[PDB]
Write a protein that binds this ligand. Sequence first.
Ligand SMILES: C#CCCC1(CCC(=O)Nc2cccn3c(C)nnc23)NN1
Length: 127
Amino acid sequence: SMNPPPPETSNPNKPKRQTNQLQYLLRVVLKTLWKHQFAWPFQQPVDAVKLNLPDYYKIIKTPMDMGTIKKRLENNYYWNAQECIQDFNTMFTNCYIYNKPGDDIVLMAEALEKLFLQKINELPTEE
Ligand SMILES: C#CCCC1(CCC(=O)Nc2cccn3c(C)nnc23)NN1
C-alpha cells in the first residue's frame, strides 16, 4: 500500500501575505477546531496504509487536513483567507465524499464544520 506525497506546505515561488484575516484563521478558526475532541482524524494527512483504506486516494484527488492547514498558516503559505477557507471546505467535502453517510467520521467532520461556519461567519474586516 502507498500514500501520495502530502499537499505542499512550502513554496518559495508562491507570493505570501500576513494579514489580520489569515491571523484570525490561525488564532481563532484552526485553534478552535484543533483542540476539539473530534479533531484527531483530521490533524494529519489520511494514512491510507495504517487506516487500511486502499481506495481512499482512488476517490480523493484533492486531499486536505488540518495538519497541512496548520503548517500553511504557521509558514505564511497563503496570499488570502479564501485560499485557507477553501482548504477547510476541501477537508470537510473529502470526508463526506469518501465515507458512508452516517458513519462516526462524518459526525466528527459535521461537529468541526459547525464551529468552522460559526467562526468564518465573523471573519474580521481587512485592515
Ligand atoms: C471497520 C472499519 C473501517 C471503518 C470505516 C472506514 C472509513 C474510515 O476509516 N475513514 C476515515 C478514518 C480516519 C480519518 N478519515 C478522514 C479524515 N476521512 N475518512 C476517514 N468508517 N467506516
